Design an enzyme around this catalytic site. Structure first.
Site, mmCIF file in Angstrom:
data_model
loop_
_atom_site.group_PDB
_atom_site.id
_atom_site.type_symbol
_atom_site.label_atom_id
_atom_site.label_comp_id
_atom_site.label_asym_id
_atom_site.label_seq_id
_atom_site.Cartn_x
_atom_site.Cartn_y
_atom_site.Cartn_z
ATOM 1 N N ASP A 51 -14.487 1.600 1.176
ATOM 2 C CA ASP A 51 -13.764 2.053 -0.006
ATOM 3 C C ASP A 51 -14.536 1.747 -1.282
ATOM 4 O O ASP A 51 -14.390 2.463 -2.279
ATOM 5 C CB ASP A 51 -12.378 1.409 -0.055
ATOM 6 C CG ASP A 51 -11.455 1.931 1.028
ATOM 7 O OD1 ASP A 51 -11.765 2.988 1.616
ATOM 8 O OD2 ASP A 51 -10.419 1.284 1.292
ATOM 9 N N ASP A 80 0.835 -1.193 0.000
ATOM 10 C CA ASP A 80 0.000 0.000 0.000
ATOM 11 C C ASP A 80 0.875 1.249 0.000
ATOM 12 O O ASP A 80 1.777 1.390 0.832
ATOM 13 C CB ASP A 80 -0.926 -0.011 1.216
ATOM 14 C CG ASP A 80 -1.944 1.115 1.190
ATOM 15 O OD1 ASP A 80 -1.992 1.866 0.192
ATOM 16 O OD2 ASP A 80 -2.702 1.246 2.174
ATOM 17 N N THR A 139 -3.888 8.114 -4.579
ATOM 18 C CA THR A 139 -3.040 8.857 -3.653
ATOM 19 C C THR A 139 -1.646 9.062 -4.233
ATOM 20 O O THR A 139 -1.120 10.181 -4.235
ATOM 21 C CB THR A 139 -2.964 8.130 -2.310
ATOM 22 O OG1 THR A 139 -4.276 8.029 -1.743
ATOM 23 C CG2 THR A 139 -2.058 8.885 -1.347
ATOM 24 N N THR A 140 -1.032 7.988 -4.734
ATOM 25 C CA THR A 140 0.286 8.101 -5.346
ATOM 26 C C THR A 140 0.231 8.762 -6.717
ATOM 27 O O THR A 140 1.268 9.213 -7.215
ATOM 28 C CB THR A 140 0.935 6.721 -5.467
ATOM 29 O OG1 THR A 140 0.104 5.866 -6.262
ATOM 30 C CG2 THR A 140 1.120 6.099 -4.089
#
Lengths: 514, 528, 487, 506
Positions: free
Chosen positions: C355, C44, C77-78
């Protein structure tokens, strides 16, 4: 340890130079922010240069003077925290060449004190009363620069005419003829009746409420009318049943007796109390806002009374709480219902109806309008203002050129360096504006050089004053038309406190650290 | 190894020397002071001369030095341009190396873009030089070559070079087989003192040596007989042996008195034929100067043997290895020989008027500063060298310079990038970016901002015209500014342009210069 | 000086250097070395960044901005850090060597962000939000490679029932229009219930409580129980005072009594003859949800309790034991009940379902889909080259550098694919011009193919928030040109 | 930019040496040459020639000084100070981002406007309010003021004016007037000589003859040695005969008697040569009234040819009779315990000699050089009729006009021209500091009347005060002020245009 001579004098200049070079990036709204990291490792992001010097850790005797310099500036005005540090640090930079010239530091300090008191009268010829109110409006561009970051800036050209006219009628004397502009004026109400370009200005106060029964005429007592503001309800409320109806029954009889043609009730009006208002031609109002009647009492000269605490007396206190209003009229608002109140004794408050695509945008335009009006209100609050953007520093540079020859006695070189020291402020602003600093500073002096030749002759043809610098467009325009103004009180306190901090630095020839 | 960036170290070593050549080209550029090993300060704009004086053991730098000699020898212009173009190709190639692209596609990309660039150069030519060789017509080609050195003097120096070229070129028509102009036939002289306005154009070779004798100059009669003697003046001896030795004092009287009768007898036979001038390439004895004063023969000495070969084509004289044989077939003819003051000193001038047309000319220069006379002297040699490029091989074609062509070619290169499929799309786009360094250096050396000139050049050459035929002006270059108000101006108004023979030949040299550096992934040398 | 501006780009590169291979479904596993001897093998991206110890202060700013995006959406996010990190790399020679003013670069990114959002709106495709089968392949991005892959058929019905229940159009131009007006926080909050089965799991609408009956003998079947809410419990503020507090509630004769706090044994005998159940131990946070599913006005003092309370719309009183524990089922809100064979299974479904519904709302908010697998990032870079020629200004140079950073995301998936990045990016760029941006990248195979077959689509709001935060994160690093230390 | 800053300090180091040497009252610098010879002079030319600085930019300031001394000859000190001052003014402009190219461009426009103002300040005046004799006399007292000779300057001006009038006004040179120092004696007793005189270093015998009164002596140059003495070579001659030992000492006297006889037939009464004359001939010349002086310098022999029109012949055979020359009167003075030889009354003499007397040799050296500054003022007065007011007059106005013209100019050139105008203040500064006056007080007081519209206000070099140099009789030629701005700008443009300095060892 004890260090004297010119070795400690050069270290004090380089120390203040290193501190000054840090705050040069935050000068002006176009400037860059900075991060301050402590031993814990946290940090903060802010564009305000006042809070930077307070949280900045610097160990140096003159460094703590700049901390007290920023604290004194915030307690008085609060604007120019970065400018007062750069001006004070620029005098220390030019002191290097004065040491090799064998110039005594007292003459350097004395030469600055003479030029400081002399520059006060030079500002008097600059500053002037508010003008250019006929044939054009210079107040429309002051708020336009602050609204350029919001959606309202596109339609601000059409909305600027309604803001200027509303602030001129609310000007009062305040306490003993101040002739200022109150910040509590310009009531804010949001309604959407038409497109954005159809927004109309209301020259007066506008109360948000309904007429209750519509069988009564909307226009009555055109000559004179009195408005009674009473928080006390006309409907039976909890603390025998019909006894509560008899208590409020006599309270209605004291209305017609007092002669009040407007009844304002926050909790509404019952049907029995409204029936008597129809035959008496008295317009009733239901569900009044408590915050709205606060300013109405001061505008109409009334006093809000929720309950009667005086003895056993029960009545409306005729003529005591009755306001003064010339006329009350109502027109079709295109799917809106309000009541207009105009022509009172002393109002000092206005009202404007905000209009937009939806009430969701009007909810954001409601609170953001106070920030846009704060720029114009705080500027016009002081009756003495001067154009900013480099006009003060450029005007004083020309006056000190001829004045340095009229004194002499080693003071000509000090005034010549003090005059050129004011050019660092416009040069630093040009760095953050991406424009060439050497081009803007040089061309600025060329315009003010020929402008002061015909100034003492009291005659001019093509020579005009107030040549500033526009950082947004990167061109030379008039600051009066650009809408950038700063009061003189902030100008005098900035230059006086900058030199006062510089004198204490130049008087220390030795640093003794035990 | 490649893990340490060996290919980057070869570029970084040249990049540190790249900024030296970026300030060379252009009138507003900078020059480098190089102290010679003989203890004399030598400074010049031309990089080909400075690279010869600088000792550099780096073979990667020598690749650009040898490529610079191609611009100096075969051409009269482009020495500073090849160093800027080849130096930028190494910097823009770092983006492809970091992405993991092999050197094959980088070299192959420049080869494909080279043929596309050379093909478009034929359409970049609007006007053509008629090669009229008129004094006013030669000012168009010579001015940009003389420019970018000693800015402000290009107006006066233009008439000096244009007049000398017309004197070298003989009058002919409809014949292109036989060459005419010669580079070594034009020699420039310099003397301290005077001013620039006192310069002129003279046909001949100016001699700054003293007359050495009582005869300063000959008469005004045309066709003066001039004899060039290689053997020095001495007593007549025998070709076989004939060594003079000292034994007895009785032979001493015959040695002193013998040289007086023999030398006087040889000068008498020459003066009887009417020869008024004797040229001795070697030293002249003391007794020989006394006899030439009574016979009325001008004394002239030429210690430099390099000028004796070019002198035979001017006056017509021939050198004689022997002495005392005034052959009439070896005698030359010159109309006018006088003595004038050049730079404050009396010097014997050698010139003519009409008859015996010669291809040798000399531009007289004057000035107070000695170092400034060196650059102007070398600028004339570089200025006349462009005359050789005016011949049949594309000598009349021209293209607008001063940053006008380099910006216009960017739109053509980027158009062919998306048209050619394959991995070559990355090399074609970077090929046009490497040409942006030329206009950028012109703005930095002129004091102009980088953020100013660059966006103004793109907006000038890129417009929306509802039609196929291009309109407005494509001649917009990089303006020095420093005058007028704002903007640029047409470069054709000042008659400044880059000759196609200089630009087209420089492209093949610039591509091959950077190709060798990028193709070498390893170097091995020894400690020295 | 200029050294602080270099450290800002270097600090942004050091943070993104770890997540370079962490982008995409093919992301590999990372090993974090702790000073105590422990290792973290999780792949993650945002879970590792919280444990990374950084020095330069700008690295902490990238961690706070990534935490905000992690709460709103589960993925991407990344993506923001890599997209914003490559901008400073292409603009590094422009800020130093080219001597370009930083605000010009910041202002160019603001104008490029507006044009970037316009391209995203053009490449978007319409999608039906009411189709239950269309939402299966969408939410599957948060489903596959997880334990819920087997129950995914049943998981799609549980997520759509909760979103469609709490959404309200309320379209109009007067007060402003929220699209479907979804509230995830209060309404979609999930409480894990032990025992049961995942296949039989259903979406309950109401408030659920696990507390049992406080009296040994009580009727287990009530026709229509009426919920009564109160603040102060039944106790001495002695026997008449407790009974007096009950007479105020019994004035309407309720059949159910729910007390927030505990109930003493003295109050149980008074409410026993009244025919009402006593329920104690009720949390305060759930009291707001009970009033909305019932309508009983929350009142502090018992004597002030209004008679307007209603017990209508009560499904069942059944106390039947489920999972060896007595439950209560009361089924403008809903309560998701996750039933399973153990607590460890329900704990993993919890975060997975939250999620999954976050991605589900992402499709509900914006009724449009964008191509994934680097197709959207490459299609925007193609449009940037066309609009760069019409700008004609100083901003053209930093504007063209954006297209180089837009192609780094599809190049990232190629670095994990194993093929030649230069060969694939050259051919992939030409397929978007004549292919109507239908040419994506296949992760499993690694050959460039169209996305019409596999049908990989992602909602637009994720793509919009990814490019919007990246510009705000890249410009914020350029806003600070100087860094100082000390308290 | 690192090498450019290094070139700034190199120009200041060279400028600092020439600052105390600016002005007649300025200090003198001491430089020790590798030859171990002490040289002290205030002239910037000779100072820079003896330094031989390896630095390329510092050598440029030396090379431009030679061009100032060649075409002009005056102002070699001020041209370097003005050129190096631009290096200090351009130092802060480099750190601010302003390129030196636009700085060099502003100088070309500033000097072009300054030269036009020089011709406006130059007024041609000859016979107006001035006579022929008093014109050159008032100019000599300017350089002699504030000196130890001010009391005796009345007698010194008469000898200085007669030195210039003794030569053709079309061609004048400072090297044509010879000056010989006479140790001892009164300063007011010095006299002027029309002919040429030398030091007379001959210490040998043969005194008390050759009186100072001659009628018409004949002058003849000499090349070889007339004496029979052979200093270098020799020979070995030995005989074994007893009676021959007498005759083998008796011979050589006859050898040169053959060539010496031809000298008597010529009748030359003056014998001078660049070689020492033997003591053998010092008697018979007194019988024929022939004068002879040996150990004469080579530089003093060149003036003899230009005086009577003589010629140098190797031998005594081919000497022609018309090469002889004669003067009107001869004089020889024994003052100073040394005999001095001088010629008087030569109508064809192209040179003259002015003798100076004093109490010490070091005192006369300061008087001789103080006269050279007055000679250049007298010489350039008749050569060039266009003169400008000096002593701060012209220097301050050139800086004033550039301040008004910069107001109409926009861009970086405004502060560049103002920097060039500020750089002009170093010239009057060093003149006040070297003279003892305070440069700070005068700078403020001189700018007072300078703004009243009169451009002729100078600086008084005697008593500290502000005023006009017209009453001080301070005159300067216009060719010096024009060429100083061009030479200083050209030398500055070459240094600022070189960013990188490369020096290869060989």
């Amino acid at each position: 340890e004890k260090i004297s001579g010119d070795d400690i004098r050069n270290q004090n200049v380089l120390a203040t130079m290193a501190v000054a070079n840090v705050v040069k990036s935050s000068l002006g709204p176009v400037g860059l922010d900075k991060m301050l990291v402590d031993d814990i490792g946290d940090f903060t992001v802010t564009n305000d240069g006042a809070t930077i010097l307070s949280l900045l850790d610097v160990q140096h005797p003159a460094g703590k003077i700049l901390v007290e310099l920023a604290q004194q500036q915030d307690r008085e005005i609060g604007d120019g925290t970065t400018s007062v540090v750069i001006i004070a640090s620029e005098l220390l930079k030019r002191a290097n060449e004065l040491v090799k010239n064998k110039i005594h530091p007292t003459t350097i300090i004395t030469g600055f004190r003479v030029a400081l008191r002399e520059a006060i009268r030079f500002i008097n010829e600059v500053l002037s009363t508010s003008v250019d109110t006929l044939g054009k409006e210079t107040l429309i561009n002051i708020a336009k620069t602050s609204m350029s970051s919001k959606i309202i800036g596109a339609d601000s050209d059409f909305f600027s005419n309604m803001v200027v006219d509303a602030l001129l009628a609310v000007k009062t004397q305040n306490s003993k003829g101040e002739i200022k502009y109150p910040v509590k004026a310009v009531n804010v109400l949001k309604a959407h009746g038409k497109s954005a370009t159809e927004s109309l200005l209301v020259p007066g106060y506008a109360l948000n409420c309904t007429v209750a029964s519509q069988a009564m005429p909307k226009r009555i007592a055109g000559g004179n009318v009195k408005i009674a503001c009473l928080d006390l309800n006309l409907q039976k409320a909890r603390m025998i049943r019909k006894r509560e109806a008899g208590i409020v029954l006599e309270r209605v009889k004291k209305i017609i007796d007092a002669g009040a043609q407007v009844v304002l009730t926050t909790k509404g009006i019952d049907d029995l109390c409204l029936k008597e208002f129809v035959e008496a031609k008295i317009m009733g109002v239901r569900r009044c806002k408590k915050e709205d009647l606060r300013r109405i009492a001061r505008a109409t000269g009334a006093t809000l009374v929720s309950s009667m605490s005086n003895l056993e007396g029960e009545e409306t206190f005729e003529s005591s709480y009755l306001g003064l209003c010339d006329e009350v009229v109502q027109a079709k608002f295109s799917d809106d219902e309000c009541i207009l109140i105009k022509g009172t004794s002393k109002h000092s408050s206005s009202s404007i109806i905000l209009r937009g695509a939806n009430d969701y945008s009007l909810d954001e335009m409601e609170r953001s309008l106070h920030d846009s009006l704060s720029v114009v209100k705080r500027t016009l609050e002081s009756g003495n203002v001067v154009p900013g953007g480099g006009c003060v520093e450029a005007a004083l540079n020309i006056y000190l050129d001829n004045f340095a020859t009229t004194v002499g006695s080693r003071e000509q070189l000090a005034i010549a360096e003090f005059a050129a020291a004011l050019l660092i402020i416009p040069k630093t602003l040009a760095v953050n504006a991406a424009k060439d600093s050497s081009e803007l500073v040089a061309k600025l002096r060329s315009y003010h050089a020929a402008s002061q030749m015909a100034k003492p002759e009291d005659v001019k043809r093509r020579s005009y004053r107030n040549y500033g610098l526009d950082l947004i467009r990167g061109k030379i325009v008039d600051e009066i038309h650009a809408g950038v103004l700063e009061p003189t009180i902030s100008k005098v306190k900035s230059l006086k406190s900058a030199l006062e901090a510089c004198v204490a630095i130049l008087r220390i020839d030795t640093m003794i650290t035990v | 190894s490649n893990a340490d960036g060996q290919i980057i170290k070869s570029i970084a070593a040249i990049r540190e020397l790249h900024q030296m050549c970026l300030t060379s080209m252009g009138p507003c550029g900078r020059n480098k002071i190089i102290v010679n090993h003989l203890g004399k300060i030598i400074i010049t704009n031309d990089a080909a001369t400075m690279l010869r004086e600088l000792d550099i053991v780096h073979p990667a730098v020598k690749v650009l030095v040898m490529a610079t000699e191609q611009q100096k020898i075969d051409m009269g212009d482009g020495t500073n341009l090849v160093m800027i173009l080849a130096g930028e190709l190494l910097n823009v190639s770092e983006k492809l190396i970091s992405m993991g692209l092999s050197a094959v596609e980088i070299i192959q990309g420049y080869n494909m873009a080279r043929k596309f660039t050379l093909k478009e150069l034929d359409e970049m030519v609007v006007g053509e030089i008629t090669d009229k060789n008129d004094k006013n017509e030669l000012l168009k080609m010579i001015k940009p070559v003389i420019s970018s050195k000693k800015y402000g003097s290009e107006d006066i120096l233009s008439e000096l070079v244009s007049e000398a070229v017309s004197h070298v070129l003989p009058v002919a028509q409809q014949a292109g087989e036989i060459p005419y102009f010669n580079v070594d036939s034009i020699r420039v002289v310099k003397i301290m003192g005077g001013s620039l306005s006192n310069s002129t154009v003279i046909k001949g070779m100016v001699f700054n040596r003293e007359p050495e004798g009582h005869v300063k100059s000959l008469s005004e009669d045309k066709k003066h007989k001039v004899a060039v003697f290689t053997c020095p003046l001495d007593i007549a001896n025998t070709e076989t042996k004939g060594t003079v030795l000292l034994h007895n004092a009785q032979e001493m009287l015959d040695f002193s008195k013998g040289e007086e009768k023999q030398i006087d007898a040889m000068m008498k036979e020459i003066a009887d034929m009417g020869v008024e001038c004797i040229v001795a390439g070697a030293g002249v004895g003391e007794l020989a100067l006394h006899y030439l004063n009574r016979y009325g023969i001008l004394v002239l000495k030429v210690p430099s043997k390099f000028e004796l070969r070019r002198l035979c084509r001017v006056c017509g004289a021939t050198p004689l290895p022997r002495l005392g044989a005034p052959t009439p077939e070896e005698l030359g003819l010159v109309e006018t020989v006088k003595t004038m003051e050049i730079g404050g000193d009396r010097v014997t001038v050698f010139k003519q008027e009409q008859g015996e047309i010669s291809r040798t000319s000399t531009i007289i220069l004057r000035g107070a500063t000695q170092n400034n006379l060196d650059d102007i002297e070398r600028a004339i040699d570089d200025g006349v060298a462009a005359v050789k490029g005016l011949m049949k091989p594309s000598g009349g074609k021209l293209l607008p310079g001063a940053g006008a062509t380099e910006i216009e070619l960017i739109s053509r290169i980027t158009k062919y990038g998306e048209r050619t499929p394959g991995l070559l799309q990355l090399a074609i786009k970077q090929f046009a970016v490497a040409f942006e360094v030329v206009p950028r250096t012109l703005a930095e050396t002129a004091g102009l901002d980088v953020n100013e000139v660059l966006p103004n050049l793109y907006a000038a050459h890129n417009v929306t015209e509802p039609g196929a035929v291009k309109t407005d002006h494509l001649y917009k270059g990089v303006d020095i500014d420093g005058e007028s108000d704002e903007g640029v101006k047409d470069i054709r108004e000042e008659n400044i342009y880059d000759m196609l023979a200089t630009k087209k030949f420089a492209i093949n040299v610039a591509t091959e210069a950077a190709t060798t550096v990028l193709s070498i992934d390893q170097i091995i040398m020894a400690k020295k | 000086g200029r050294q602080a501006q270099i450290s800002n780009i270097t600090a942004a590169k050091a943070v993104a250097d770890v997540i370079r291979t962490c982008l995409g479904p093919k992301a590999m596993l990372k090993m974090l070395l702790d000073p105590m001897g422990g290792l973290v093998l999780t792949n993650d991206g945002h879970a590792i960044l919280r444990e990374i110890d950084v020095a330069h202060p700008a690295a902490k700013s990238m961690l706070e901005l990534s935490r905000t995006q992690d709460e709103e959406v589960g993925d991407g996010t990344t993506t923001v850090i890599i997209l914003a990190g490559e901008i400073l790399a292409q603009c590094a020679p422009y800020l130093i060597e080219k001597n370009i003013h930083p605000v010009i670069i910041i202002q160019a990114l603001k104008k490029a962000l507006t044009d970037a959002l316009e391209v995203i709106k053009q490449v978007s495709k319409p999608v039906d939000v009411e189709n239950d089968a269309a939402m299966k392949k969408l939410i599957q991005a948060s489903i596959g490679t997880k334990y819920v892959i087997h129950w995914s058929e049943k998981m799609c019905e549980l997520a759509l029932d909760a979103v469609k229940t709490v959404r309200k159009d309320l379209g109009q131009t007067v007060e402003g229009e929220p699209n479907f007006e979804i509230d995830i926080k209060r309404y979609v909050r999930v409480e894990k219930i032990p025992g049961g089965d995942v296949l039989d799991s259903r979406v309950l609408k109401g408030v659920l409580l696990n507390k049992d009956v406080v009296h040994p003998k009580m009727s287990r079947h009530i026709e229509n129980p009426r919920v009564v809410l109160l603040d102060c419990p039944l106790e001495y503020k002695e026997e008449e005072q407790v009974q007096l507090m009950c007479e105020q509630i019994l004035a309407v004769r309720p059949t159910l009594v729910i007390t927030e706090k505990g109930v003493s044994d003295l109050a149980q005998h008074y409410l026993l003859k009244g025919g009402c159940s006593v329920l104690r131990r009720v949390k305060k946070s759930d009291n707001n949800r009970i009033a909305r599913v019932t309508g009983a006005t929350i009142v502090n003092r018992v004597e002030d309790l209004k008679e307007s309370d209603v017990g209508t719309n009560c499904g069942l009183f059944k106390v039947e034991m489920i999972g060896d524990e007595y439950f209560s089922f009361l089924d403008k809100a809903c309560t998701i009940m996750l039933r399973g064979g153990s607590k460890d299974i329900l704990n993993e479904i919890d975060r997975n379902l939250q999620d999954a519904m976050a991605v589900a709302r992402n499709v509900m908010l914006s009724p449009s889909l964008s191509p994934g697998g680097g197709a959207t990032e490459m299609a925007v870079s193609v449009k940037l080259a066309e609009k760069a020629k019409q700008l004609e200004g100083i901003q053209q140079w930093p504007y063209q550098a954006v297209a180089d950073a837009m192609e780094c995301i599809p190049r990232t998936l190629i670095q994990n694919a194993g093929g030649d990045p230069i060969r694939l990016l050259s051919q992939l760029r030409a397929k978007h011009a004549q292919g109507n941006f239908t040419t994506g990248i296949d992760g499993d195979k690694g050959k460039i193919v169209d996305m019409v077959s596999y049908g990989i689509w992602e909602p637009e709001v994720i793509k919009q928030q990814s490019v919007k935060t990246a510009i705000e994160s890249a410009c914020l690093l350029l806003r600070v040109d100087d860094i100082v230390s000390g308290v | 930019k690192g090498q450019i800053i290094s070139n700034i300090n190199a120009c200041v180091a060279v400028q600092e040496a020439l600052k105390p040497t600016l002005g007649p009252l300025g200090s003198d610098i001491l430089i020790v040459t590798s030859n171990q010879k002490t040289t002290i002079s205030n002239d910037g030319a000779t100072i820079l020639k003896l330094l031989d600085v390896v630095h390329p930019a510092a050598k440029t300031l030396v090379d431009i000084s030679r061009a100032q001394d060649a075409e002009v000859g005056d102002g070699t000190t001020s041209v370097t100070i003005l050129a190096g001052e631009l290096m200090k003014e351009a130092k802060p402009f480099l750190e601010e981002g302003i390129s030196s190219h636009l700085i060099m461009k502003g100088y070309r426009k500033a000097v072009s406007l300054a030269v036009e103002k020089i011709n406006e300040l130059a007024v041609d005046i000859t016979s107006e309010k001035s006579s022929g004799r008093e014109l050159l006399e008032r100019c000599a007292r300017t350089a002699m003021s504030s000196k130890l000779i001010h009391n005796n300057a009345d007698f010194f001006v008469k000898m200085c004016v007669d030195a210039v009038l003794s030569l053709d006004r079309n061609d004048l040179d400072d090297k044509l007037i010879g000056i010989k120092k006479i140790p001892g004696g009164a300063m007011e007793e010095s006299l002027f000589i029309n002919g040429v005189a030398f030091k007379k270093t001959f210490s040998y015998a043969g005194f008390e003859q050759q009186p100072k009164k001659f009628n018409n002596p004949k002058i003849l140059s000499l090349n070889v040695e007339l004496e029979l003495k052979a200093e270098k070579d020799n020979a070995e001659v030995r005989v074994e005969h007893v009676e021959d030992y007498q005759a083998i000492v008796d011979a050589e006297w006859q050898l040169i008697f053959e060539k010496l006889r031809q000298v008597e037939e010529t009748g030359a009464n003056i014998v001078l040569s660049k070689l020492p004359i033997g003591d053998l001939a010092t008697q018979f010349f007194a019988d024929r009234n022939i004068f002879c002086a040996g150990r004469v310098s080579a530089d003093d022999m060149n003036r003899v040819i230009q005086a009577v029109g003589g010629s140098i012949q190797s031998t005594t055979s081919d000497i022609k009779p018309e090469h002889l020359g004669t003067c009107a009167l001869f004089e020889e003075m024994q003052i100073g315990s040394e005999r001095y030889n001088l010629f008087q009354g030569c109508p064809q003499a192209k040179t003259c000699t002015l003798l100076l007397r004093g109490g010490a040799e070091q005192v006369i050296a300061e008087v001789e050089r103080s006269l050279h500054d007055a000679i250049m003022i007298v010489k350039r007065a008749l050569q060039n009729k266009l003169i400008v007011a000096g002593g701060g007059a012209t220097e301050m106005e050139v800086s004033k006009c550039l301040r008004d013209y910069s107001k109409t100019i926009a861009g970086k050139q405004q502060m560049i021209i103002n920097a060039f105008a500020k750089a002009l203040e170093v010239i009057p500064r060093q003149l006040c500091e070297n003279a003892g006056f305070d440069a700070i007080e005068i700078l403020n007081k001189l700018r007072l009347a300078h703004s009243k519209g009169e451009k002729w206000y100078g600086v008084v070099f005697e008593t500290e005060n502000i005023g006009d140099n017209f009453a001080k009789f301070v005159w300067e030629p216009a060719l010096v002020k024009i060429n100083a701005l061009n030479s200083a700008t050209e030398a500055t443009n070459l240094i600022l245009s070189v960013d990188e300095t490369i020096t290869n060892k060989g």
